[PDB]
């Protein structure tokens, strides 16, 4: 029998056409019917029927039953190659999903092939199928994501590897440069889109915490000129302005912030080989201004590592600075104002904090758009030009002054090396706005910082309230106590009499008593209400003990980074890496990217001695040398290789110690008589600071 | 004159209040605080700009101030840009219905300019939530 | 006989292989030997031998002897298609012309085909052959040009049509836009290069006048900063700096200025269809910065008409203005100077000439680089902004004031309407520099002028002294008298006693006596020395009677247009068209390019009435209307179509006359009650000025 | 000190005249008329810049003034640009022989920079007859 008149495939038919063909040693009917039904897209709509009309278990059973030789596996790839252009153009033009919701049923049939991971699919079948999937409507994508969220973790990892292998093969099999790009490649774009679908499925498959959302921040008022212009146009205040959000994000209704612990770690979705071949300078433009064919990869930030996301944020900030400079030039030309294209911040070395606070307050309350200008800090009492060296100096001293325990601004826990907000900082709000604005300007100006905060601070900054699970990083002792209380299986009304009337110590030493509920002293903690006690105690500690201070800090931070794509690109677990830097000192990477000028060559007599000396440097001496030269003791975001160190020849063998131009990480090294003299001079030079 | 609902917003509606016609009305700019000539007041009437009141006083905008501050707003509050077809798909509302103004002269785009943008595949711009494009008068060399 | 062992072709062999084949009705040997010898490039080097080793007459004889049927003509095109890539790569790589000068001998053989003009060559043969010709060395091009210069005029016209037909076919057979260009097309570039070769052959084939060359102008001294910089670099003064000249021009040694009357008029070489498809905005860039494949057409200015050469000059001037604005912005930013990006020219309405003269003198003697800034004329006593309307106003009034016969600056001849330099303008040099600078700034700022000068003035401005042949335009009566004297066949020592002692009248009326030679009163004019008398009298009149005034005028004109490509693009016969404008008033062209704003539509009730009224306008009323609206009574360079007139609706039917915004050629037309009222208002409005 | 032939031109040659070494010589700029520090005088020695004399006085240039006026000259007296191979064909002299300086820092290009220009196909620039290119230090991001 040839089975020439079959239009739909069910479990028993695809099972009864097996024994007969095996006994008659004729596998031709199997392959011919497979190539007939599968290549015809409409056939899969009804084949293997019963918000899903497809029995996934039956699909798995038939797939493991048919994938048993070297001939049946070849009957699927050709059918896929024939089907994919047809389904692609059908979804593009005929709008098939509009007329029926069961057209999507073929996608799960196709994607349940456990051999999709095999290398033979990466040539022509998988790229076309991913193009067809990327050409799918939004509601179908949402329902497919909802279906995928029910899968087990290893299945989700399997899909993630299935798409990442295709991405790696497509970026390896071709070369890209400034001439030919990766954005215009259709197959890689489709693969990234399906990877985004899988990543959002993973995000929505885990726990979702939407109730503990921080209150929406107040958008800063623009300058009076823009308000007058909006009044003239009659638009006035319209609620159509907001952050750029993924259409899939608003269709699903669940943000990536809600997902606390996903099934698969977020770092797995990051694709390594794509980043080294991806250029941010064009990707940001393709993201801002839409292009007919090119697809920017910043629309899917998960696929980017911390090195390139920083590049995109820096490009956005630089473009904003350039626009501000253009506006200042236009003002000076037309209106006739003095050209002031810099955020002049003149402060005294002894009172940096107060002068910076008052200047920033008078700028913010008058010109909220002035903060977007390029920073230019000129210390009072000294004459010079800040090309990038004094700003980091001011940042370092302002960090030291603000984070001083003497002011009592932040409590210090030596067991963790993590400052925490001090609830007792009463009548002191300007300094919290000052430190928030300092962090914002640091992100804006690409200057790293030595700031130690628990992850709960960054989670609250992003817009998610702190909870019990975040207490471990902040208060490990309290977290241990409350988890021991939760894990007690006995009666808590018999051993301890701890109630909602909770008392805590103070900085001076005198404890104070706090009430969680209306009358905590009268209601003791029992077994049934124990769960609703810890989630309130931790909530109080992380939210309303610092309700006033952290509100001002968040407002100050958001005043600068309101228009930046920082809220869109970075998760709370990457903000600390963006602001601070890596603590690993790898001078081997610094060896490769170091540049020479002034006559020094790579294979010079003194360069090798200097490199030997610095390699033989002590763990702390490396930090001292880095702080002396580049103005900071921390590696930049990424590694030391990104720090384009430059060594410049100064002059003959003298008794003058080497000097460093901090603005460009430039070290001025004279040619000394020998290696030991150079080592002595370097030791004497890096220790003064 | 302290209740905004009573106070008019459009130029001819405001003219009807003062028992004067648009032919010989007297108006002064809001930024430079200088009197508008006939050309700019007629252009203000044509461009459909709402009258702004400061301390209960009528005010309009002159061509120089308008074209300067619109350029400033474009340079400052530029959000992103989109194609005409993509904008149509996003809003699902016909292009002739959405209110689109020129980037420079702030004049609403007639359907001819929107069609020209569609055929020439020029890019619509978003300025602080205000969709905008290039008019015919401002795109002439 | 098949003639299987022939390596070179001579006149008798190509003649003896004809009668035998005709009698035996077998033309196969002819076509096969033609395809053998011609396709092999090395064969033509020795075939048909004797700074030319090829008997051109024999080539003509054999070509007219063989071009007699429909089969032999097809034996050349295939051989050309096979040969051309080989010769092209041979000249490109092997440098064959270096090893021998007789390799060029094949080019004349190929180009002597009188059927090259036929349409069948434009498909594949002629483009490849022109590519091979364009890939030829410079010395070979020079010697080929020297050989071609001996041809008769109709032959040169034949070559010119041969290349122009190819150019027209190549521009017609393909479409070009901003996406796909014409510069990158290799065939059209090669055709233009061979057309340039033919054009220079025509130029050098006519009369060459190199002795009557004007003295080299003194290059203006740059600002002191550039002099100090050159001193620091040690380069100091370098004579290498000069105008961009054609390598073929310096190889031939004869400039296009020397050619007075070419064999073919220069306007014939102008290609019409290419200009409407050629974009200057990219051609100028390809001319300035070299591109790997694109070839700018401004390197061959003859192929461009006056409309597009003006576009190139305007683009160059605009780029210079932009660079000056950038420099001013940089000054204001770094040094801290007041931003002054305009050439502020504040003058009084009554004394424009003197105020402009003193301001321009104080600018030139202090900041020679200030003249390159954009002009901005603000009349004293009136407040406003000159967006392009006051500058043309100032130009018109300065022209009227300077060219007033009251000052005696220029003599007026009513029989020709052409002002001439007044030799009696003693102790008045500043005004001539003023008018020269006015003309230079007019060319720079794209503002036409009402200036009437003879062609000899522009010839002297370009750098060629006036001669006897140029006297007709300046002094027709004197030219007639001297040509009658020259054409007298009798003895001039018997009828008149005119000697070198020549007297002329003065403006007051009292004549003065001038001596041409040492003692002109003692040597009379004879028959043998009659020729060397007119060429000295006219030389004196056109050169040394105005030696002082015209030197200052030329210096003033060159002070502004020293760096412009005006000396490179425009011949002296086009300078007057660039400065002045066309006198033909064609409102039909203005109909098509007129634009409407303010609510007016093309098919409006009042627009048609206005168009009827202006079409029914008198010859002088059209000039009055144009002067009222656009500030000038002359059509721009090209036609009225290039004048982008704009009509803007003002308001309701009022009694106020229409007003014109001269900066943008904008006419403000209110909607009147009927057509007759609009006509009356227009008549009353255009007559005030 | 009024005869240019007697007066030296190079920094070490000038140093030999005053019986002082380059280690602790004192020099002042020509534009801003301010004393050069050690870094800029050593850079002046390295860049092979000829000493300019004003009224019989030694003078050098500081980094700010040099990099500002070189930029001004580039913006003002830019003539055209050419490729390395085309420049070689024009001059017929090897690239390592022609004196090519940086546009910004006015430092002569070592053969490494010229080779990098050749491979990367960067364009040499002509500034008032002074051929120039981009050095290694001024082309680092
Ligand atoms: Zn105004
Ligand atoms: Zn407009
Ligand atoms: Zn200086
Ligand atoms: Zn440099």
Numbering used by the authors:
A (entry chain A), C (entry chain C): 120 to 169, 231 to 869
B (entry chain B), D (entry chain D): 9 to 149
Can I see the authors' text?
Human protein E6AP/UBE3A, the founding member of the HECT-type ubiquitin ligase family, was originally identified as an associated partner of the viral oncoprotein E6 of human papillomaviruses (HPVs). The E6 oncoprotein from high-risk HPV types hijacks the ligase activity of the host E6AP to ubiquitinate the tumor suppressor p5313, leading to the aberrant p53 degradation. Here, by using cryogenic electronic microscopy, we reveal that the structures of full-length E6AP and E6AP/E6 complex are monomer and dimer of E6AP/E6 protomer, respectively.
After several rounds of 3D classification, we identified five distinct conformational states of the E6AP/E6 complex and resolved the structures of these five conformations at resolutions ranging from 2.6 to 4.4 Å. We therefore assigned the five conformations into one of two classes: attached (Att) or detached (Det). As such, the conformation of E6AP/E6 complex changes from Att1, through Att2 to Att3. Intriguingly, despite substantial variation in the structure of the E6AP/E6 complex, the inter–α1-helical interaction remains intact; albeit there are some changes at the interface between the two α1-helices (238 Å2 for Att1, 222 Å2 for Att2, 209 Å2 for Att3, 157 Å2 for Det1 and 145 Å2 for Det2). The Det and Att conformations of the E6AP/E6 complex presented in this study should be structurally relevant to these accepting and donating processes, respectively.
